[PDB]
Amino acid sequence: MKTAYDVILAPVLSEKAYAGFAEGKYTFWVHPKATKTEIKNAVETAFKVKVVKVNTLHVRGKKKRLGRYLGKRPDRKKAIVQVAPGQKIEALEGL
Amino acid sequence: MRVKMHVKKGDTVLVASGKYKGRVGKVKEVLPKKYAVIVEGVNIVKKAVRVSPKYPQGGFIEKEAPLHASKVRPICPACGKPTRVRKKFLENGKKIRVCAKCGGALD
Amino acid sequence: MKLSEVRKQLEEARKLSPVELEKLVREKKRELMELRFQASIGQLSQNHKIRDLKRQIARLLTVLNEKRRQ
Amino acid sequence: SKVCEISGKRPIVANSIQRRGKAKREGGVGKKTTGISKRRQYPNLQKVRVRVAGQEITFRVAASHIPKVYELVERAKGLKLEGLSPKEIKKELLKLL
RNA sequence: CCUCUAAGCACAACCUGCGGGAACCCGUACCGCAAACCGACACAGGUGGGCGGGUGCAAGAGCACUCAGGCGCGCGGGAGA
RNA sequence: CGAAUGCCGGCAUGAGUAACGAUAAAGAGGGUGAGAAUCCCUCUCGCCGUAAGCCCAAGGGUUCCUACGCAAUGGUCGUCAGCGUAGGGUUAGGCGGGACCUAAGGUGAAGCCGAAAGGCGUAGCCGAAGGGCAGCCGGUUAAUAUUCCGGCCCUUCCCGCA
RNA sequence: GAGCCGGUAGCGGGCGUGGAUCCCUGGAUGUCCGAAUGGGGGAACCCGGCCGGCGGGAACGCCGGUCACCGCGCGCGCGGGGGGAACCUGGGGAACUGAAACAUCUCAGUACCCAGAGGAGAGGAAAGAGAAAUCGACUCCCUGAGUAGCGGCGAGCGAAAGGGGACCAGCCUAAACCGUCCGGCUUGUCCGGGCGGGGUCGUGGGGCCCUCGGACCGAAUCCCCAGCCUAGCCGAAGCUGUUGGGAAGCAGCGCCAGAGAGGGUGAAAGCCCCGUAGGCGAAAGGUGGGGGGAUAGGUGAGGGUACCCGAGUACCCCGUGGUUCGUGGAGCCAUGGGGGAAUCUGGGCGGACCACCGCCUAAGGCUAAGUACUCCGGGUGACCGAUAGCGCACCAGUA
Ligand SMILES: [Mg+2]
Ligand SMILES: [Mg+2]
Ligand SMILES: [Mg+2]
Ligand SMILES: [Mg+2]
Ligand SMILES: [Mg+2]
Ligand SMILES: [Mg+2]
Ligand SMILES: [Mg+2]
Ligand SMILES: [Mg+2]
Ligand SMILES: [Mg+2]
Ligand SMILES: [Mg+2]
Ligand SMILES: [Mg+2]
Ligand SMILES: [Mg+2]
Ligand SMILES: [Mg+2]
Ligand SMILES: [Mg+2]
Ligand SMILES: [Mg+2]
Ligand SMILES: [Mg+2]
Ligand SMILES: [Mg+2]
Ligand SMILES: [Mg+2]
Ligand SMILES: [Mg+2]
Ligand SMILES: [Mg+2]
Ligand SMILES: [Mg+2]
Ligand SMILES: [Mg+2]
Ligand SMILES: [Mg+2]
Ligand SMILES: [Mg+2]
Ligand SMILES: [Mg+2]
Ligand SMILES: [Mg+2]
Ligand SMILES: [Mg+2]
Ligand SMILES: [Mg+2]
Ligand SMILES: [Mg+2]
Ligand SMILES: [Mg+2]
Ligand SMILES: [Mg+2]
Ligand SMILES: [Mg+2]
Ligand SMILES: [Mg+2]
Ligand SMILES: [Mg+2]
Ligand SMILES: [Mg+2]
Ligand SMILES: [Mg+2]
Ligand SMILES: [Mg+2]
Ligand SMILES: [Mg+2]
Ligand SMILES: [Mg+2]
Ligand SMILES: [Mg+2]
Ligand SMILES: [Mg+2]
Ligand SMILES: [Mg+2]
Ligand SMILES: [Mg+2]
Ligand SMILES: [Mg+2]
Ligand SMILES: [Mg+2]
Ligand SMILES: [Mg+2]
Ligand SMILES: [Mg+2]
Ligand SMILES: [Mg+2]
Ligand SMILES: [Mg+2]
Ligand SMILES: [Mg+2]
Ligand SMILES: [Mg+2]
Ligand SMILES: [Mg+2]
Ligand SMILES: [Mg+2]
Ligand SMILES: [Mg+2]
Ligand SMILES: [Mg+2]
Ligand SMILES: [Mg+2]
Ligand SMILES: [Mg+2]
Ligand SMILES: [Mg+2]
Ligand SMILES: [Mg+2]
Ligand SMILES: [Mg+2]
Ligand SMILES: [Mg+2]
Ligand SMILES: [Mg+2]
Ligand SMILES: [Mg+2]
Ligand SMILES: [Mg+2]
Ligand SMILES: [Mg+2]
Ligand SMILES: [Mg+2]
Ligand SMILES: [Mg+2]
Ligand SMILES: [Mg+2]
Ligand SMILES: [Mg+2]
Ligand SMILES: [Mg+2]
Ligand SMILES: [Mg+2]
Ligand SMILES: [Mg+2]
Ligand SMILES: [Mg+2]
Ligand SMILES: [Mg+2]
Ligand SMILES: [Mg+2]
Ligand SMILES: [Mg+2]
Ligand SMILES: [Mg+2]
Ligand SMILES: [Mg+2]
Ligand SMILES: [Mg+2]
Ligand SMILES: [Mg+2]
Ligand SMILES: [Mg+2]
Ligand SMILES: [Mg+2]
Ligand SMILES: [Mg+2]
Ligand SMILES: [Mg+2]
Ligand SMILES: [Mg+2]
Ligand SMILES: [Mg+2]
Ligand SMILES: [Mg+2]
Ligand SMILES: [Mg+2]
Ligand SMILES: [Mg+2]
Ligand SMILES: [Mg+2]
Ligand SMILES: [Mg+2]
Ligand SMILES: [Mg+2]
Ligand SMILES: [Mg+2]
Ligand SMILES: [Mg+2]
Ligand SMILES: [Mg+2]
Ligand SMILES: [Mg+2]
Ligand SMILES: [Mg+2]
Ligand SMILES: [Mg+2]
Ligand SMILES: [Mg+2]
Ligand SMILES: [Mg+2]
Ligand SMILES: [Mg+2]
Ligand SMILES: [Mg+2]
Ligand SMILES: [Mg+2]
Ligand SMILES: [Mg+2]
Ligand SMILES: [Mg+2]
Ligand SMILES: [Mg+2]
Ligand SMILES: [Mg+2]
Ligand SMILES: [Mg+2]
Ligand SMILES: [Mg+2]
Ligand SMILES: [Mg+2]
Ligand SMILES: [Mg+2]
Ligand SMILES: [Mg+2]
Ligand SMILES: [Mg+2]
Ligand SMILES: [Mg+2]
Ligand SMILES: [Mg+2]
Ligand SMILES: [Mg+2]
Ligand SMILES: [Mg+2]
Ligand SMILES: [Mg+2]
Ligand SMILES: [Mg+2]
Ligand SMILES: [Mg+2]
Ligand SMILES: [Mg+2]
Ligand SMILES: [Mg+2]
Ligand SMILES: [Mg+2]
Ligand SMILES: [Mg+2]
Ligand SMILES: [Mg+2]
Ligand SMILES: [Mg+2]
Ligand SMILES: [Mg+2]
Ligand SMILES: [Mg+2]
Ligand SMILES: [Mg+2]
Ligand SMILES: [Mg+2]
Ligand SMILES: [Mg+2]
Ligand SMILES: [Mg+2]
Ligand SMILES: [Mg+2]
Ligand SMILES: [Mg+2]
Ligand SMILES: [Mg+2]
Ligand SMILES: [Mg+2]
Ligand SMILES: [Mg+2]
Ligand SMILES: [Mg+2]
Ligand SMILES: [Mg+2]
Ligand SMILES: [Mg+2]
Ligand SMILES: [Mg+2]
Ligand SMILES: [Mg+2]
Ligand SMILES: [Mg+2]
Ligand SMILES: [Mg+2]
Ligand SMILES: [Mg+2]
Ligand SMILES: [Mg+2]
Ligand SMILES: [Mg+2]
Ligand SMILES: [Mg+2]
Ligand SMILES: [Mg+2]
Ligand SMILES: [Mg+2]
Ligand SMILES: [Mg+2]
Ligand SMILES: [Mg+2]
Ligand SMILES: [Mg+2]
Ligand SMILES: [Mg+2]
Ligand SMILES: [Mg+2]
Ligand SMILES: [Mg+2]
Ligand SMILES: [Mg+2]
Ligand SMILES: [Mg+2]
Ligand SMILES: [Zn+2]
């Protein structure tokens, strides 16, 4: 069955992600078939918050090699939800 | 399907052949893929290791090497003699290893 | 997981109800996502816990399916 | 240049043979073939507009079985046929063949 | 978009004004007159659209000098047949 | 097998030979580094400027940013790079394309045609760099922004009131 | 039946006699594209209708279910669509070449294209063959035979009967006649369409009409089973000494053998390991051509009657195709065009035609095995052994 935990996968762990916590903007590794409307409900129904805005984008998989073979890391998608003024997703403030 | 092993870790075996032929001991491991076995104190070999946090001071470390299974032979705990493994059908009706020299069991 | 544990998880599940199975599942899939974020930061050393849930979550959805196929 | 809807006839293939000279039976050397080339023979198809169940039914049938159409018609009298549409009355007749 | 009526509907419906809420999928990096595109090459070739400043030369998207911006072209050093 | 301007491959000769891809051009200093004409900084000189500068679109597809590297690619050298490894980076209700429209053309209810395959065909559907539609300025990051932030505007749809 | 978390070690953590990994059969899940089918589409992308659920949910979005077209059958049901290495049948169908040029001819109805089918396909129960006064469906192999014949009688093409083998099997309908339901108008002894009965053959048979007589066959459909397939299991008999890195080598003494095929083990092992001869084995799917049982289905005789016995068909001519037959004396089989019958006193045939004598009984259909191929699995080679053998022994239809 599909649950908000199936939409949200892992957090974006970078200097750029972190720097969004102050403004309440939390970044995640979502599902490429996920949807801004689909994400929202997933964050809320999982982090007890009020999503006010969502910004998503696709991250294409990098091409890599074991010297002799060429492949590609999977393609990923990530969202950038804005939470109501004053709310916090603590598990990410972690940091 | 399965690799046929007449010996299992860790019953007592007789190094039938090889440089350590005649020596005896327990089977410290069983390698079906290469169809080999490691025996305690047998096939000893000196191997090198980097000056590494695990192996400070560098140096070498005596490893126990594997042997082809056809080289090892089990020792019946009864007659204490190395024997060929038959297989007995109890009334369980399980099958059990049993010495061929004497009807003893081997586990 | 351990077998005996597995067996129980089947006995216990097959005693349950689809709602109590969806609700149950819905939780362990939360229990995963918790673990996913831990490993994502390296603070997941018992990383075998993951595989269990998914295969717990799997064993659950199955028994859920056993019921509904009727 | 197609298929009889009643006889199943169909364009066959025939050769166009060209012969020269006097035959033997006419006290000659004999005929000689100067050029063979495939042709194709069509059934003499024609249209057959008939009205059945207050509905016009037309067949693309060969001139040979034309008198069979009316037979089908004549034979179709004993059928619930009103209310139907053209293609429906055709298929219902053909089923009689 | 405006307008005209037809069934239907005329407690609906549509127009205007205000109010709260709602507003999805893909693309967005970088090269792009070229070392990243077409030419087997980091190839003096070919490739659509826009901007393209200043002074002087009659004019100009010409010509020469120059701002911003960008370059000295991915082998050098000597020699003076 | 000794020959087929034979076939596959390996290695020689020409030979340290021509050449190293526009005659727009170079010089010194400082640093770096085992190692520098070839990388970074600085000053002087030269060169394009209806461009050899700045945007958009096709096409390429991670080549963009940063850290650590120089065996191989770079026509030399290389501590450099569009190269090797790893990590990070592309954020739209208003910019472009869709849930809007039609063009040539493509397909194609009805219907016509053909030995089979298939070929035609008003409507309708598909079809764009044409039509139509509501975002302008600035700041921010090493790397994205008419996309995030700020200020000031606007569009459409659902519900409710008048 | 003791190790496992694939090729794959390592970092980091687990599991297994409370029987794991692994192997075999059934089931569940099975995103997106693809016949692709809700609609579109530059395949794996994009946009909808309906019913139901989620979220604070009306707009927005996600989840489950359903919605393309065609045929057949009384809006709803069963079926079709596409793929498959060759093998098979049907609809079409060349050329180089050979003829030492070349057109008829050959290459050849082969290559190729298309539709279709299946584990096989086709063919198949005589309107046959053809001279035995005989044979007895069809298919395949041998033989008949490069015979008979065909042929710018050039190059070349090339049968059939009969005989010896493999396999073996025969059936259902249409029409006359009885009955029944429906619908047509031109009212019945009517015509027409369904269904059922009846009937299916060539010593001709069948119907109706009298008359005489009233159980043994048995499936190709269904059922049960053995048998087989897809994992497996038991499986006889050697130590020592010696050279050597290693024994399976040489020496000594023994043993098994329904097993001295082969492959491994540190080298050359009947008796060390995997195996070999000889035996065992299936809860579940599949198959089941052999065994047993059902069922649909099967069957008499003389006598008279002269209703039926498969239609634009047989038959004639015209244009072709197949057969060994290239217009030849040219029949037989098939049919595009024209004309156009009959129901046993019928009709087709026996190589133009006529007669005698004989064979057969068309214009509806079905039908096992023996036959063909080899993507697949297995056994085996006086087959190759990394320029060989498949194009690939290796991440190849890849760079
Ligand atoms: Mg699921
Ligand atoms: Mg930063
Ligand atoms: Mg909310
Ligand atoms: Mg986006
Ligand atoms: Mg996107
Ligand atoms: Mg790269
Ligand atoms: Mg000893
Ligand atoms: Mg043995
Ligand atoms: Mg399990
Ligand atoms: Mg003619
Ligand atoms: Mg004559
Ligand atoms: Mg002639
Ligand atoms: Mg007419
Ligand atoms: Mg006529
Ligand atoms: Mg007929
Ligand atoms: Mg009005
Ligand atoms: Mg009205
Ligand atoms: Mg009202
Ligand atoms: Mg408003
Ligand atoms: Mg959408
Ligand atoms: Mg560049
Ligand atoms: Mg540029
Ligand atoms: Mg630029
Ligand atoms: Mg230029
Ligand atoms: Mg330009
Ligand atoms: Mg130009
Ligand atoms: Mg080229
Ligand atoms: Mg290039
Ligand atoms: Mg160039
Ligand atoms: Mg040009
Ligand atoms: Mg001027
Ligand atoms: Mg001038
Ligand atoms: Mg000029
Ligand atoms: Mg100029
Ligand atoms: Mg000039
Ligand atoms: Mg130069
Ligand atoms: Mg230069
Ligand atoms: Mg140069
Ligand atoms: Mg020089
Ligand atoms: Mg000189
Ligand atoms: Mg020679
Ligand atoms: Mg030469
Ligand atoms: Mg040469
Ligand atoms: Mg020469
Ligand atoms: Mg060569
Ligand atoms: Mg010199
Ligand atoms: Mg010279
Ligand atoms: Mg010279
Ligand atoms: Mg030179
Ligand atoms: Mg100059
Ligand atoms: Mg310097
Ligand atoms: Mg210096
Ligand atoms: Mg240098
Ligand atoms: Mg250097
Ligand atoms: Mg230079
Ligand atoms: Mg200027
Ligand atoms: Mg592009
Ligand atoms: Mg490229
Ligand atoms: Mg880079
Ligand atoms: Mg280098
Ligand atoms: Mg180097
Ligand atoms: Mg270098
Ligand atoms: Mg190089
Ligand atoms: Mg170099
Ligand atoms: Mg070069
Ligand atoms: Mg260095
Ligand atoms: Mg650097
Ligand atoms: Mg760069
Ligand atoms: Mg790089
Ligand atoms: Mg390296
Ligand atoms: Mg970084
Ligand atoms: Mg915006
Ligand atoms: Mg738009
Ligand atoms: Mg929408
Ligand atoms: Mg349109
Ligand atoms: Mg068309
Ligand atoms: Mg049109
Ligand atoms: Mg539309
Ligand atoms: Mg447009
Ligand atoms: Mg436009
Ligand atoms: Mg607008
Ligand atoms: Mg716009
Ligand atoms: Mg404005
Ligand atoms: Mg950035
Ligand atoms: Mg009102
Ligand atoms: Mg692994
Ligand atoms: Mg470890
Ligand atoms: Mg999904
Ligand atoms: Mg579809
Ligand atoms: Mg479509
Ligand atoms: Mg709904
Ligand atoms: Mg949702
Ligand atoms: Mg849905
Ligand atoms: Mg098929
Ligand atoms: Mg054919
Ligand atoms: Mg042709
Ligand atoms: Mg020819
Ligand atoms: Mg030839
Ligand atoms: Mg010849
Ligand atoms: Mg030939
Ligand atoms: Mg010739
Ligand atoms: Mg010749
Ligand atoms: Mg010629
Ligand atoms: Mg031929
Ligand atoms: Mg054919
Ligand atoms: Mg097809
Ligand atoms: Mg097919
Ligand atoms: Mg068979
Ligand atoms: Mg058949
Ligand atoms: Mg018959
Ligand atoms: Mg003969
Ligand atoms: Mg002969
Ligand atoms: Mg002759
Ligand atoms: Mg021939
Ligand atoms: Mg015969
Ligand atoms: Mg015979
Ligand atoms: Mg046989
Ligand atoms: Mg028989
Ligand atoms: Mg009747
Ligand atoms: Mg009779
Ligand atoms: Mg039968
Ligand atoms: Mg054994
Ligand atoms: Mg020794
Ligand atoms: Mg010995
Ligand atoms: Mg042997
Ligand atoms: Mg043998
Ligand atoms: Mg051997
Ligand atoms: Mg030998
Ligand atoms: Mg041996
Ligand atoms: Mg046997
Ligand atoms: Mg058995
Ligand atoms: Mg009878
Ligand atoms: Mg009688
Ligand atoms: Mg009669
Ligand atoms: Mg002919
Ligand atoms: Mg003649
Ligand atoms: Mg003829
Ligand atoms: Mg004949
Ligand atoms: Mg005819
Ligand atoms: Mg007669
Ligand atoms: Mg007669
Ligand atoms: Mg005849
Ligand atoms: Mg005749
Ligand atoms: Mg005759
Ligand atoms: Mg005859
Ligand atoms: Mg005769
Ligand atoms: Mg006669
Ligand atoms: Mg006959
Ligand atoms: Mg007949
Ligand atoms: Mg048949
Ligand atoms: Mg068959
Ligand atoms: Mg057969
Ligand atoms: Mg094979
Ligand atoms: Mg060999
Ligand atoms: Mg050999
Ligand atoms: Mg090789
Ligand atoms: Mg090879
Ligand atoms: Mg070799
Ligand atoms: Zn014993």
- By the 10 Å C-beta count (0-12 exposed, 13-18 middle, 19+ buried), B92 is classed as exposed
Residues 16-75 in A having a C-beta less than 7 A from any atom of strand F are 16-17, 23, 25, 36, 53, 55-60, 62-65
The H or E element that residue A81 is part of is strand A76-83
Structure tokens at B95: 């099958």
Give one DSSP letter per residue of C1-57, joined into a string.
--HHHHHHHHHHHHTS-HHHHHHHHHHHHHHHHHHHHHHHTT--S-THHHHHHHHHH
CB of D79 closer than 8 Å to CB of D92: yes
Q: Please report, in angstroms and rounded to a whole number, the separation of the first and last CA atoms in chain B.
A: 23
Nucleotide lying nearest to C8, CA to C1' measure: G18
E-strand ranges in B1-107 read 12-15, 24-31, 36-39, 44-48, 60-64, 66-68, 72-74, 85-89, 95-99
Task: Tell me whether residues A5 and C22 touch, CB distance under 8 A.
Answer: no
CA C15 to C1' F46, in angstroms, rounded, equals 90
Say whether C26 and A91 touch across the interface (CB within 8 A): no
d(CA B24, CA B74): 9
Protein CA B93 to sugar C1' G219 (Å):
48
How many residues does the structure list for chain B?
Answer: 107
Q: What is the 3-state secondary structure (H, E, C) of chain D?
A: CCCCCCCCCCCECCEEEEEECCCCCCCCCCCEEEEEEECCECCCEEEEEEEECCEEEEEEEECCCHHHHHHHHHHHCCCCCCCCCHHHHHHHHHCCC
Instruction: Tell me the residue type at B30.
Output: V
Rounded CA-CA distance C25/C23 in Å is: 5
- In eight-state DSSP terms, residue A19 is T
Q: Which two tokens stand for residue A8?
A: 């949200």
Residues in chain A: 95
**E strand residue ranges, B12-78:** 12-15, 24-31, 36-39, 44-48, 60-64, 66-68, 72-74
> Other C-beta atoms within 10 Å of C64: how many?
21
- Decide: C56 and C28 in contact? Cβ < 8 Å: yes
**Phi-psi sector, A37: left (phi>0), alpha (psi -120 to 50), beta:** alpha
Distance CA D77, CA C47 (A): 83
Of A3, A8, A9, the CB nearest to C26: A3
CB-CB: which of C33, C41, C61 is closest to A5? Answer: C33
* CB-CB neighbors (< 8 A) of A13 in chain C: 40-41
Question: What method was applied to determine this entry?
Answer: X-ray
Residue D47: beta bridge partners?
Answer: D60
Pairing of strands B95-99, D15-20: unpaired
Interchain CB contacts (distance < 8 Å): A and C? 27
